[PDB]
């Protein structure tokens, strides 16, 4: 009568434990207080970390390190970072339509930015683990427990399912796995063929309300296009498109159950976060001395560190110290949500004080987080034209100081939905109450993402 | 303890012509099912019909036309993996180790066979299993595989339990994103492949048999890069997945319709990219034969002692109507003693037919007895020699002994008498750690490879 | 004292004969009246094809079937074609510079037309023999017999040079075997890498008085370049460029003494010119019932036939019928050359009434053998709005039809000459005396060649 | 009768210290040189200077990387054709016969060795030899090559004719033409050319003693292409150009300079990629060495029994002062009898000095001797015995045996002694063609692959 299936889990034998040394190293860090945890019992959490211990790997380790080589690239201004996907993933939503549509929103975006940036463009996606997010208040406006993400309770507003529930680490774990099986099956499928990607921008074309501001750049990839098959080069000489996944790494009894120790077949032995082939960490969780900043330090990922408008140049250079300490390209990417109105005030001093430091970070525009405002009808949203202005903000403080944009993080969805303000599409604080589906953040639509990267491209043009 | 799946309180419907043929095909009769009540049943049908599918419509129809190439002499199929996947031995060295052994096996047989060979793996799924009593050997209800009772022999743990369903497809997908993680990385590299055959050559008590092929090998390898071509040059090694279509729940959960880019819509089974139906579910008019029909996926049918030339024509007429070319594979399984004699008139009459099936051996499941010690078993030498008679009755027939479809692990258990180990009777209680017919451990299988690559050479 | 020397020829002994039943229909068809033939002495004719029958081909007939294949999807509307180079080629500029200088023209309008077709290129060059070529008058305005090209007299004015000499045809054998082996290396070393050629566009752009005219389609394949390095497309990936010999077939003892019959290999043997890869069958040689046609019906080659403004549709008709008896498409090649103020209304019907027979021609365009004139300053010279008018009216006619206009025939050189009038350059009639080195019909220097080159691309793009 | 050519009546100058530097190599004294007169042999080299070269400077960049390989251990050499090219056999069926049997060597090595195989032909330039005596045993004066003089025995014939200057280029250019029409043609096709061992296992007398290797080069030409490799994604067959630097007044003739897309202007010569220096002509301050020091080409110098390990460090340091890997091939041509004694000392002075040359053997020209019938001739197992000596030493020592350098023809003559052939000293007089030395033949040349390729193997 609670409409819903209890699966089984049986305490099955664990694989060999991880090393003393690094479990030393592990249990050092994670004695360092961690903001924003579930605050479920600690025995309970135990038996559920004890299962995902024992479970297949969301990603692979020589994933991972072909990632941070291609990032290498980013931060040395030969590459270009495409980050996004969903605020939050719910287990209901985490269907194929709605996968498929993320990773085609995300595929047509990367090949406009390909084409604007005359260089190859990493494609990141908020998808397969993006299930926990913090809150600033415990008590909502309808006098329940926040909603904290689908990985520590449910989105409906009663109290029974707002209590934090750790068997959600497995159901979080099964939803994430079984939506990465899909992304591996669609990238290595048709669904990322060059040629098929594009006349979807034909469908944008043709069917937006300023499609007649974009005819000319997309006609102009579309003859790039032909060019490469009228050169004799075919689909299976591109190879099969790579996308890669990345959550905020925020619940740590998740993050260190998913921890694996690499082969040392490729030389020397590492811990890698499994869940994920990259993370970051958030405005609300990047305590200097906390455990997710210690965390970050010992997985051999690459990482995020999300920087808004109280950061100063200072406190830049400690998470470059912390975060780099070998000096890797790419390692570590520095995420500036600054809001349109103080990115060309805030971020110059950051930048000048870290490229000083001697290290190669990646500078990523999250022209989103730094907009959000509330509707008088009543939806927390944003507006496309801020979200257009700070990324054109971000850039002219890289050009002005010769430093590499590296790329952007965006939260968007193929879906048709009515959650941004803006675009061609115009929509109004009227519109908000069709099709407002997001159990977090406002989502760039399809359309919207879309006419975003076209924008983008030309601010790469120039 | 628990997790907890929301059923969806809440898909476009399907084509009329397949819905009536679905129906149709699944109020037939169907035997070795699972006894559980219909109203979680339907529950956790419901719930599979949400999530994502393990396979997709595209990767069939690639499999499909790679089978149609060993259908017509030009490639080769090895199917193999454990008899039943565990959910408590669903891990990473598990499943990493299944996956190594079949691509050792399938270079070897590359090599042997001068042409392609199809890789399908028996994991992400093979969960179900038929029995021939429903009471075992202790007395209690036996075990039907993970999906629908526990191995262990307690009668709490034997009930049939729905929600494993949904357990299942969770270890299936979880199974197979990282399948398709490991061969696009390096495990599935030539090089990185052969060097194992050197392992097995030096630290075999028959390497020395086995060292003039292994060398003939490596030294094909070296030609290839020799020549220029590095592993970027090479397709990516693809495994597909399979299991026997048993649990029908489950199946017609994991039904999706396709899409119109090529042509009518159809159903896919994306459960797997390929299946096979067992010799116990076999029916000419049962329900498995019938959802057969109804689905793209090509599909197999088990073969055993019993079988008829006009029964194999029936199969063949029903499952390959359009006359599509590996559409069909019929796995004969017959036993080393009766192949020689019972394979030929049935190869006859089908090839008659005008159709053209993959005709794959299993060599274990015709051969299987019990030990003086308690164990059931199977000789190696009676496996191979199935197998070598597959071949004598192909050779004298001009046809092409299509495949092999066989019980492995990547772990050297102790499970069938023989080998170079020679592993004996007393040898089995050492690593007996399947949970129903025994494999070919590591060095077996790996000997079965070399074994059959000779065959094909003669 | 003649200022020369002298290269002994040994008779050698010659190949197994050409079958007897081949050399039968052979003799039938050069039985027929050959016009512009030289007039030296027959014995001595003989001589100098018994040698030539012994040398290596400069070409193999793999490579004629493989453009056969390439030419036939140019008659299918899905490639086009490029035929490009002197209008004479001369012994003593028979040199690396000059060569190289022409297959880089060559390789530049191809990538430039690629892009604006949309499709792909096939690149054949008037080069390694086009020696010879036929006269209206026998008497020039020098008083002399009239210079017919280096495979029969010499070009400077004096008698003793002008006497026509058959031991040119085994000079010009070696001339072009050894320009041949030039253009091979160069096509198969960075030469024809396709992002040095179009660096040499970013060189025209910034030096040509109308490069602010063609920057904005410069800069669109630039980018259409990067965009497939980007993808990871590398050199080779595209595989080598591929650059045919061709020149018109008006000396019949050098083109019957390069007969060769074909290995059988591939299934059937039959006749190949092994002089070139195709050749053509020019306006004073191609009486239907003479010997360069029924020459064209025995050998395997592609070929083309010049159509000038008194053709009628149906002796084009007829010539579809000889040349294209089994209906291979881009087998025939016919190529207008009918002057800008006469295409537009005299190719219409020659047009339909050829497509009516059900056969699949090449249509190309020759815009300069129609629009010769003499300047008042004294050079024969052609006008370059003149030849790109006829261009763009040769489109019309096909745009109109809905037929396809299948390439261009045009006399080019990679040297910066004063030959043509007009262009960006605006060369007037003064300007042709500075360097005016044809030794027969003027070309478009480096500069116009690819200012044509964009001019067609986009009447492409149209 | 003849043709003429035009001296230009009428090129941007050399820079200043190139100039001096070939100035000065070419005031040195040099063998072997042609006695004919300074003002036509001007004339010629002016004709000579504006002629399209027969190679480009790219090809011998890209020629020069590939033997950095060979001397570094990870390929080998193979180099082969005519003793001397005539203008008379210039033709189109014994360039195919050249081309194929070097193609044909080739793979079976590249299979061998594990390893790529550098393919340089002794073609489109090997009109030029030198004697010992001026006056021949018939009384007249030597032939020294088509480039010199006339192969028949007439005094007049025998003149040394400058015009064959530009008649040698002629051939050189047009045969060079043909070659590298037929490399990208299919004559270079893998799979062509394995189909021409089994027609050569078939006739031969001791095909049976090749037929296992044969089999196993056939299956791994198979692997390849069951791994998805097809023709087209293997890098084009290139077969490199060289000869015999001898006549200076041709190899000065066809020099040209550089661009500086790639770093400083340098002298190429371009009528060849790779050229060699001789014996006779090898004098260590002699007007060979000195070219050889201002040309960028890959060079090699021939070393035979009164060979110093002194004498061979100074020619490295000379020709490979900056210490480029596969700038030098230091070609060993000893005698079957003397290579085992006289090579190792030799080599282990070179490799002290840093340096990374490539050890060739050439087994011909130390194993001539002069028949009872009248003919010139070698005997097959002093060739196959002189390589394998060669290898033996490299053994002994650890060094890389590099390659090898044959005289053959892809016709069937009667020129060397022996081969599962067995030709006799009364077989000679059927088909000896040859304008100089006595090459291996067809099938010999084939036979000797495949033993050296055992050679590799062991
Ligand atoms: N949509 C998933 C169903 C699911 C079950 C098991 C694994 C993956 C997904 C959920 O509701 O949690
Ligand atoms: N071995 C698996 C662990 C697992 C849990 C959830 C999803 C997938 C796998 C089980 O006990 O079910
Ligand atoms: N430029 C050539 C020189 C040449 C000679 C021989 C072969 C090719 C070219 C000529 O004057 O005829
Ligand atoms: N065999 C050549 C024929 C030849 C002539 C001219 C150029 C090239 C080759 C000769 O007698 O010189
Ligand atoms: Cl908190
Ligand atoms: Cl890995
Ligand atoms: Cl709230
Ligand atoms: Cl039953
Ligand atoms: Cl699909
Ligand atoms: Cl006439
Ligand atoms: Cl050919
Ligand atoms: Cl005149
Ligand atoms: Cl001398
Ligand atoms: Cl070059
Ligand atoms: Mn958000
Ligand atoms: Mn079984
Ligand atoms: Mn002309
Ligand atoms: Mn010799």
Redesign the pocket.
Known sequence: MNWTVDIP??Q?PSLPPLPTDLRTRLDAALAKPAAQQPTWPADQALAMRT?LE??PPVTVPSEIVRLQEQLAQVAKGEAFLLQGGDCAETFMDNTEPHIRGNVRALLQMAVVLTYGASMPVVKVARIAGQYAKPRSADIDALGLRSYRGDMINGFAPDAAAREHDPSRL?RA??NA?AAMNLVRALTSSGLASLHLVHDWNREFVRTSPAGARYEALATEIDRGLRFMSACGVADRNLQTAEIYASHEALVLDYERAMLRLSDGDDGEPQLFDLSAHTVWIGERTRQIDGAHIAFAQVIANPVGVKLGPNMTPELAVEYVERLDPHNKPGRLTLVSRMGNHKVRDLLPPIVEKVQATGHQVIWQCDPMHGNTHESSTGFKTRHFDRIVDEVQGFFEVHRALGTHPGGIHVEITGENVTECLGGAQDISETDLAGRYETACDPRLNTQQSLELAFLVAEMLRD
């Open positions: 889990i049986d099955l299962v024992s479970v497995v774990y099964a796995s």
